[PDB]
Write a protein that binds this ligand. Structure first.
Ligand SMILES: Nc1ncnc2c1ncn2[C@@H]1O[C@H](COP(=O)(O)OP(=O)(O)NP(=O)(O)O)[C@@H](O)[C@H]1O
Ligand SMILES: Nc1ncnc2c1ncn2[C@@H]1O[C@H](COP(=O)(O)OP(=O)(O)NP(=O)(O)O)[C@@H](O)[C@H]1O
Ligand SMILES: OC[C@H]1O[C@H](O)[C@H](O)[C@@H](O)[C@H]1O
Ligand SMILES: OC[C@H]1O[C@H](O)[C@H](O)[C@@H](O)[C@H]1O
Ligand SMILES: [Mg+2]
Ligand SMILES: [Mg+2]
Lengths: 391, 390
């Protein structure tokens, strides 16, 4: 039991949501939903390049609990300390006249989005409490967890018609338009599409999806939070950076580009952009590779891809951080460790590490002790997707 | 006009009802397990082939409660079931080992019990409800086992893999129901995911999600409401297949190629040549159709479904007149891409792929030309087993 080891329980989480709600609203909540977060095993920054990704859902998740309102108002609360002040917010529904605006608190930017876009209708007013086990800004998609969780609740409010992909699309837009973060599709999907003891190999181009099992009692998924959070002014930049490269190469995406082919436009694309593209191109393949290694059970070959991945992300994409790099280094230092890399967005957050379960504990100390920061550890297993919880 | 399929809600309540009724109290636990339609890849599961199923919105509901009492008492709501509809009995033990007898419908549950991996296991009161036709070729068997199982994990949670739970139910059907089944049924039952068909490799146990999210496309399930079970034939086919493979020093028919199949002609019987030919043929087709589908070639997709049927009717001999009548009828409706029997065969259902615009004509058309009473279902890809909260 590391002391830095967190085992948040959903039963718990609900109970919390039940309490604050009861306390904040004076009564028992009517509805209960929850959207999990996700860790990317490999495939960073391909998302928005129509690349492959191989995330997996966690037990860390966002629980929303609440009730409709005759009232006609939107009124929320966030039990999260990681959020932006104030922790509460109330606002009136949009109308054909008045349409919600991304304001302050920024946290609320997420909810509003999912509200402003929700497909169906008519949408009531609601009382809502937001509980979460997903560290804010930790590389584990607290973003998507939040959005989805919101959307799924709304579904309880006003049932929709559409596909799952649509849902992801919704939440995505809301992030794009409301939170100002041109993200990709990954996060939402896996938040929706998740499944037990299984990893998802998703095709960002096609949206095709495949399940790679993760049910080994001898394999272990260790996530370490650096607890640092630097360069989000950066994301959209890389995005642009690629977009532009792909442009030069007369290609729709960098997905249609090949390691070998990039060296063609060497003189047709900026240095920087060369590097970015390179990472992306190799990363995508590296991803198709690691799923194969995994299905096959080549945890070694998998621990290696991961490392490569890290490095690309450090050197060519430039989205890591000394902390990350440190955390990785330390991990790699333990015996029983297949590989380790930074997960998610980059510029701080978490790392993900594959190892021998029995090594888990040693890893926890080595790391702690060699990480010149406050480290948080999660011994993760692939979880299920967005789901309604009946009170 | 399509039969309208109870929504869990409905099914639940009904479950509630008879339970409160039959046990004098309000249920503690509830869980549901869907049924299934196989788009293709028939009779390929116990040959380590490929199948293409999707879960149904027809499922089984199980609302029950524990028993300090130490026993197992159940009751099914389905009329198509075995008499008696009520079946009390004593939990298994070291010395006591469940004995599959009567009613036969009980056999299923016993197995899922006898094998539940975990312990300790309490006693129970459970009501069984289902919108799935018993013997409709939609897996009323795997939808049950599953729910049971899904129940028992509530009574004494499980640690193992999904594939592990599947194996249980399977062993139960196998050892207890007397049905040597393959893997498909159970898997999809658990594995199912809303708006997705499932390409399962019953060799690698590997599976991939295929998006069935297109309004303009419909999956029509037509019930012949006929049952000949020539169940007797099933274990039979399993054999031939197996024999052959043997002759060919092959682990599984999955190891053989249509093309290599010539070789054995002299090596194997004539009939057994046809069976393999179906299997071996069913696997490539399944493989191709999935691509077709992915690809969005509904047209090709259907072409493959029709071939499957012929194969199924002529080489494997698992069709039935009513089945061939229904398919033939379907194929004649414009908008229809393909149709074919589904499930084990010898009765039950047909699955049709067409243009959602066509559903109504079809339904009419099939009824007209059907010298029996068909029941229809307009299927939508559903999710797997879930835990129901009361
Ligand atoms: N439970 C929550 N309560 C309030 N706000 C939250 C909650 N979860 C997330 N947020 C909001 O969402 C933001 C997360 O932004 P983001 O940069 O995407 O982090 P992340 O998704 O967790 N990391 P990554 O998955 O790598 O992108 C926070 O800064 C909040 O504004
Ligand atoms: N809810 C239920 N209650 C009682 N018995 C049931 C129930 N569901 C299934 N069964 C039992 O399981 C049997 C299922 O028949 P089965 O031979 O498995 O065909 P099927 O599963 O409906 N179709 P197929 O997918 O082709 O196997 C029924 O005849 C019953 O004996
Ligand atoms: O892969 C990096 C990651 O960055 C953020 O988490 C985005 O939301 C994701 O879509 C993805 O781009
Ligand atoms: O594809 C035919 C089908 O026959 C029965 O339904 C079996 O339970 C399945 O495993 C499969 O063999
Ligand atoms: Mg995010
Ligand atoms: Mg069956």
């Amino acid at each position: 039991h590391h002391a830095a080891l967190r085992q948040p329980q959903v039963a718990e989480l609900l109970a919390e949501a039940r309490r604050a709600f009861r306390e904040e609203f004076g009564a028992e909540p009517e509805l209960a939903v929850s959207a999990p977060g996700r860790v990317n095993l490999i495939g960073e920054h391909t998302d928005y390049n129509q690349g492959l990704v191989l995330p997996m859902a966690l037990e860390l998740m966002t629980v929303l609990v609440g009730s409709p309102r005759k009232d006609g108002l939107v009124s929320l609360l966030t039990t999260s300390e990681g959020a932006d002040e104030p922790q509460r917010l109330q606002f009136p529904l949009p109308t054909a006249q008045r349409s919600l605006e991304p304001g302050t608190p920024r946290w609320a930017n997420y909810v509003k989005g999912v509200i402003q876009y929700y497909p169906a209708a008519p949408l009531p007013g609601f009382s809502a409490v937001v509980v979460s086990s997903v560290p804010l800004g930790g590389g584990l998609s607290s973003s998507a967890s939040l959005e989805v969780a919101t959307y799924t609740f709304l579904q309880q409010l006003c049932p929709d018609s559409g596909t799952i992909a649509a849902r992801a699309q919704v939440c995505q837009q809301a992030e794009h338009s409301f939170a100002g973060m041109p993200c990709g599709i990954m996060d939402q999907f896996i938040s929706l599409m998740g499944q037990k003891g299984h990893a998802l190999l998703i095709d960002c181009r096609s949206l095709e999806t495949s399940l790679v099992p993760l049910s080994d009692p001898k394999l272990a998924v260790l996530i370490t939070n650096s607890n640092v959070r630097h360069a989000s002014s950066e994301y959209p930049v890389r995005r642009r950076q690629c977009e532009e490269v792909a442009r030069a190469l007369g290609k729709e995406s960098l997905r249609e580009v090949q390691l070998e082919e990039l060296e063609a436009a060497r003189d047709l694309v900026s240095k920087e952009g060369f590097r970015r593209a390179r990472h992306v191109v190799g990363e995508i393949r590296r991803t198709a590779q690691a799923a194969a290694a995994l299905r096959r059970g080549d945890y070694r070959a998998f621990g290696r891809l991961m490392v490569e991945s890290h490095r690309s992300l450090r050197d060519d994409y430039e989205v890591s951080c000394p902390e990350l790099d440190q955390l990785v280094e330390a991990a790699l230092a333990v015996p029983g460790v297949y590989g380790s890399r930074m997960t998610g967005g980059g510029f701080g957050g978490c790392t993900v590490t594959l190892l021998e379960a029995s090594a888990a504990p040693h890893a926890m100390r080595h790391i702690q002790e060699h990480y010149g920061g406050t480290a948080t550890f999660y011994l993760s297993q692939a979880a299920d997707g967005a789901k309604v919880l009946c009170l």
